[PDB]
A paper describes a structure:
Enolase is a glycolytic enzyme that requires a divalent metal ion (optimally Mg2+) bound in the active site to catalyze the dehydration of 2-phosphoglycerate (2-PG) to phosphoenolpyruvate (PEP), as well as the reverse reaction in the gluconeogenesis pathway. Interestingly, enolase has been identified on the cell surface of S. aureus, enhancing the staphylokinase activation of plasminogen. The Sa_enolase monomer has two distinct domains, a small N-terminal domain (residues 1–137) and a large C-terminal barrel domain (residues 149–434), connected by a linker region (residues 138–148). Biochemical and structural studies indicate that the octameric form of Sa_enolase is enzymatically active in vitro and likely also in vivo, while the dimeric form is catalytically inactive and may be involved in other biological processes.
Moreover, the structure of Sa_enolase in complex with PEP was also determined at 1.6 Å resolution, enabling the elucidation of the interaction network between the enzyme and PEP. PEP-bound Sa_enolase crystals were obtained by the co-crystallization of Sa_enolase with the substrate 2-PG. The crystals belonged to space group I4, with two monomers forming a single homodimer in the asymmetric unit. Interestingly, L1 in the PEP-bound structure of Sa_enolase displays both the ‘open’ and ‘closed’ conformations. Lys343, Lys394, Asp318, Arg372 and Ser373, together with Ser42 from L1, constitute this inter­action network. On the opposite side, the PEP phosphate group forms hydrogen bonds to Arg372, Ser373 and Ser42. Although enolase is a metalloenzyme containing two metal-binding sites in the active site, our structure only displays one bound Mg2+ ion near the PEP carboxyl group. As shown in Fig. 3(d), two PEP carboxyl O atoms occupy two positions within the Mg2+-binding site through coordinate bonds. To the best of our knowledge, the structure of the PEP-bound form of Sa_enolase constitutes the first Gram-positive bacterial structure solved with ligand bound and displaying evidence of catalytic loop shifting within the active site.
Residue numbers in the entry:
A (entry chain A), B (entry chain B), C (entry chain A), D (entry chain B): 1 to 433
Amino acid sequence: MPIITDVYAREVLDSRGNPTVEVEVLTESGAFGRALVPSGASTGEHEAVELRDGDKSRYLGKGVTKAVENVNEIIAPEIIEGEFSVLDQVSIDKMMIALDGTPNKGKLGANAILGVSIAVARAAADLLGQPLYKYLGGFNGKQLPVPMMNIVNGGSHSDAPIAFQEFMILPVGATTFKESLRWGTEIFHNLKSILSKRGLETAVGDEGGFAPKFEGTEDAVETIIQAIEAAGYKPGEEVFLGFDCASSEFYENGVYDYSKFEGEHGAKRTAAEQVDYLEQLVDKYPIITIEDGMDENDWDGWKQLTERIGDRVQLVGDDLFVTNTEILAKGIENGIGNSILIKVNQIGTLTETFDAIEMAQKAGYTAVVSHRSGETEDTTIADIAVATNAGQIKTGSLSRTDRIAKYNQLLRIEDELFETAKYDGIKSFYNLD
Amino acid sequence: MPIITDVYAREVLDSRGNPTVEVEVLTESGAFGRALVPSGASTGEHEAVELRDGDKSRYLGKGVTKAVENVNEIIAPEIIEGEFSVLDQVSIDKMMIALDGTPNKGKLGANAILGVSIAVARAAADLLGQPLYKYLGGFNGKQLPVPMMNIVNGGSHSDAPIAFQEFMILPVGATTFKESLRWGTEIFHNLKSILSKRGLETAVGDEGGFAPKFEGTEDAVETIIQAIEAAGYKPGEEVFLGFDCASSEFYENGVYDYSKFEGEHGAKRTAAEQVDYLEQLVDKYPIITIEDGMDENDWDGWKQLTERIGDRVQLVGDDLFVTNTEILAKGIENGIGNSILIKVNQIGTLTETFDAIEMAQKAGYTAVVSHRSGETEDTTIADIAVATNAGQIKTGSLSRTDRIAKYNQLLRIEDELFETAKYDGIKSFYNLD
Amino acid sequence: MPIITDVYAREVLDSRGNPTVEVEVLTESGAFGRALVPSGASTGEHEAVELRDGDKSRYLGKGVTKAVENVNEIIAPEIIEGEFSVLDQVSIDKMMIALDGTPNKGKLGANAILGVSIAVARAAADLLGQPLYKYLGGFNGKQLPVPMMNIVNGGSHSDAPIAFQEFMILPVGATTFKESLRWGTEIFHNLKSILSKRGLETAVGDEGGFAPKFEGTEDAVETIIQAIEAAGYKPGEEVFLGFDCASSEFYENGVYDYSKFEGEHGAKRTAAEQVDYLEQLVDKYPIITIEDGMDENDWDGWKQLTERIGDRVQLVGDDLFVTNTEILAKGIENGIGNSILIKVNQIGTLTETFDAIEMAQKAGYTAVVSHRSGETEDTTIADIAVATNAGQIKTGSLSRTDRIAKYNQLLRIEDELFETAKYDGIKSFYNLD
Amino acid sequence: MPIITDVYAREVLDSRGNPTVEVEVLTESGAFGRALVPSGASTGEHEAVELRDGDKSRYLGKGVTKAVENVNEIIAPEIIEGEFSVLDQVSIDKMMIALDGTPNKGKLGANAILGVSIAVARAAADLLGQPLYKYLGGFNGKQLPVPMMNIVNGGSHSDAPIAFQEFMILPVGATTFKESLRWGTEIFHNLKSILSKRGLETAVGDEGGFAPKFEGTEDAVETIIQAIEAAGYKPGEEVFLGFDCASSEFYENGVYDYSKFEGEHGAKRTAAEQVDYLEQLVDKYPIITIEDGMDENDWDGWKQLTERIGDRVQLVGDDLFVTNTEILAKGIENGIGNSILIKVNQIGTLTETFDAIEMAQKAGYTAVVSHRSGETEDTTIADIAVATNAGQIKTGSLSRTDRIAKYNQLLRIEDELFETAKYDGIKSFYNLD
Ligand SMILES: [Mg+2]
Ligand SMILES: [Mg+2]
Ligand SMILES: [Mg+2]
Ligand SMILES: [Mg+2]
């Protein structure tokens, strides 16, 4: 019996110890779904906005009681009085969008809306007795993603003289996701040993990776490569590197100003020099993906970067696109990037999330389903990656259950799929030559 | 409906990126339970042994394929062919204990056995439609625990000149668990700010807390107190401190050798001087609980410590008791400690876990249900704490979902209990007079 | 379907031929529970009070039509209109406590309230298909009690020159409850034969035991020991003795006045001499438990008694505590007694009963679940003893179904538990050295 | 649904502390019945034999492990392998009779057979959702019995100089059973007061009544009458007396020898003088019923007694008929008595019990459904009395739950019947003119 009979929100905590929204949905027959909403460390703009309370007497102003109230007192009665079927996902998502009535979900909160959106879908899958990836994506959802695994952090997430925010490993050469996960974990533990022996810090950041005091970018990259090799894997064949440059954080007045993070002698690069520099790095090192290599508003620079190395390196828009199909469409039309980081809570409904993934795919772009800095015990993004046969995921390093829970769910999905599972390895990069 | 029809194990990852056991149980009617096992020890004279593979080609020898196979090929057929009801928890636990046939669960593995033990109970609660805490503890399970929250680490978990392994905060004075959690989180964020302003490290360890380069024990303690106050709480009334001294890690040849961690000039204390020192600390600072203040084999020293401050300070045996009712019984008979840290995987079944909690309670000891360093997305320990009205829990700092998931489950339990919930605050320490 | 749809009370008779309350509860799905309420011969004060009609035209004023009406016309509609789930025991108990609104349950009657409280729990266990002890106590309720079996009566329950109200046997050395019951029964029949041969009376009193015209206390005790030995059992190893002194019934103006029951030459003992006397008896005879050895208000005397023999003899507060957690807490804080007699109807709800048991256990006291002088065909107290692993029960001699029904239910519980049952024998006395 | 899937026996205790048989029956759908068997006789030419173990190491040889084994190992597999419907009562009873194959049920035991017989019927009523009296007797079972209530005992059940075994009160003049029960209880308590004031014993015997040291038969009778009046009732209109003379216990060699119980001067009466004596008593006192007034083999004396007073006094055969339809038929044919005491366990199946009741009724005799000295918490005889509209029951005095449980069940039956219940009072004696 599919009619939704209860929609209930509560305030819980995320992986950084900040409040977030949890929603539970029940049907008449007792089918049940629970969703928890993630939260970003920094937000691109043109984005759906999370509602926070700003009551400095609670949680330093980061309470989400208003968003919770919006679910319990506004959204819930609309759903229950409307006698919506739990199966009518698009109808419910459209209803919430209209109920809020603003372009950025700023009245009810993207956190209120997404909690309900995901909890409904989870309840629907429970009702049908379907794996969530098959409910979401249909019968042919079967492709496990290549994980891009955080390993070293820089920029504003570190004190080392390194401008790029994040360095990742990608176990592209593995034959299964289960194997890929083991490779990454082995490399992580090997790097930890290397860091310890060098007297560098091995405590972890928000994503479960390291932020060691390397000498600079080349030291960081070569040390990761050292770990890959020590673990017994082949860089540039079995395991590749990725960056999240987060270049907007050091771009100002037409200059990519590396002195912001790399000390007084750090290079001040024009957009042309920035492209040259990224090209030099991908020629020197086995780098298969670069996120936000150019500034969020530097469309000319993005075009040049894409013309320069886009045939052989994935170029992921994060801050560039902010999971916004209007911006994505503009990107596609202008030959900008070849991949998009998909953040469910940046847009705020599952319907819109899937629309963005579909738009990307139909343009020959990859859609990389992503975590946020503040995660939860929710593992829905694992199922979204498989539902859409996305082929890639970005969900953290190899420690902290806020990351590992997603990897464990991918293990379960691959196990359940059995002989029907596929892991396409390097062929996951259908956006590249 | 209740006959178990499937028992299935798989290898997943824990919060440190090490393999562990997951088990799923199904009944004929489709009731379902999933358990994940936290990290343990593969050796240790008096505790239950986790089984690891030792295949250095996988996960550096830390695979759990053998334990998984033991579930799938040995335990599962015994259960299924035996037509055990999912409700017959004690029967199933006793059967597994006999099936392994060794005192330390070293044949099948405590990790195999506990995975099944917990998954069965979770499936039973699902079958009955009961909250797990009520299934486990009966109708009167209703007391939320005071959380002892990791905040600063020392000893072998840090590079600072501090011998004690862990410092904790306890929001004893809160009126509800939900408020207690907020207090702790606010204190955590305030400490983080204080550390940053001092130029100390704010990256986190395995339990989600900090390991800053303090000048020593007094600096650490006073800085935590500073954070408590900055967050707006009263030390020694609303919020107390706790230690895990892990004193076995610096005791040798009859000496508590603080020079092991606190540099060349660090004190070498006899057992008498160790007791004097702990007494001095509890007289100076608002310390309500001390774990492993004396060495695991220094029973004479434990007795002296208990006589000295046990009337007004909780004295928790962890390494002292290793969740072993034979050792606990010896402790009780000899007036040793007044609390025990209860680690489900250290004993290996829910039945034995509950027996240990009950033995402790009936002696006027508190039973503090505990996490391990390697945790998972499992939240069963939250329900165990409420089921037994234990009154205390030790499940980590205020970051990392491996910890926060337990706190979120306690929020859900308190919410569900509604007007029947109780949080006893300082009266939780029924072991103190 | 757990919502309570009917709550119905009727006036029935207890084992002494006095009216009492019966309540039946039904759920929407047809789950059913029936409870009957016991009644004491004499009442301690500070107690929940039973409501009687005082209509001397019916049952000599002992009718319970008002209490029955209070269930049918006040409590029942509150429950039914409230749509309470039969599983929400604590909520329903708290609701009734508030509905009555007085400290002693004197408006609605403790008999009205307890009838509903127990019938609800019985219906809940029926709904879930659980044994009542597992519903009440959770999965680990498995310990059968050592029974303290009435055998000889004195004081105001006899015409013999004996001040103590009750003498009991305890089959502590048996390996199972089933064996323990047989031992007691054999001893009972042997005593009956001994009494008959001596020309003493073998008719029974309210609890199913004897009140023979012995020469005094030593005659009674030695004759019981004679019966134990004649039955082939070892006094002070296999079978121990117990007293219920009911000392309040002969204490006045600071004197334990044995002349009240033992004739003109009976000793008038100070509190100090009373302690000396009880100590002498426990040194001479295999006495393991003494109930109400000191007067209900003689706290100094209780303290002295507890210091004197409390390490090796159980000291049970009955009139001392009147199943009142405020009085119990005061006792615990002052080192008074080491056991409490738990009378469900003296407090009036299952929630409060369990709270009292838990408070006792967590203080290292035993909780002895008890009958009343006026019993019924209800056997709930058997399930309460096992639910809480209490380890002891006091439910009568070895005749009269008002007593034997409880023993039969313990047989069924032990049978059902099969290999999971435990009977701890002497180790049941965890309150003693 | 109705096929019997489990038949299980266990050894429990009766109201005298002697072992007896309990049986539980389950159907495929979970319908459930439990029966307990009352005390019987292990020898006796014309009745069904209870089987006892004779192992003097257990319960003084009174164990029923063999009868229990006969159920579990012989009867149960026949039923289960036979796929008998729980509704097929007569088939099952006939099968057991044939399975035992002896006239007195001495191979399997009448206690084994009756336990199964009753448990089956109780399970059938549960399956159908019918009150047991309607299942047993059809839609028109509605007549509550006049209770003949034990109050004073003599003969071998007392030490007083009184030959008759039992004196009873019968609240014939009440308008409902519920009122009749109150009358009896009030009389019982009034007698107790009278006895206490006279310094006579008020402890109770097996049936819950008194055995005081009266001066003789007239003292006993007149004192009971005093109690009736003191309670406010009219002897010989509202409340009548009954005897159980148990005359076989003092008849030998053609003489009713009252000197056996009434001292050296007690009358030695011929059968003619015995009839004269009983006639004198019924002329002097309001006696409506006499059980076993003549010896079990004195058929000529029974005939004379019946001719003398049978038109106006009920004459109940107990030892005369031993619930044996062959003996009853002989009695009917010869004009012997006008009532039979029906003891379910004396014949051993419900089918045979109902056949005996029917034979009696069709002869214009009353069938008085009876307890035994050793009773249990079973209340089936209450339902049998109503099922057959018997109009009378003999189930004990007004104390002990072994008796009171039956009266409570009659209260429930009358309550359930509501406006359809009937209590025929004096018209219940349809055998008298
Ligand atoms: Mg980014
Ligand atoms: Mg520790
Ligand atoms: Mg008492
Ligand atoms: Mg008779």
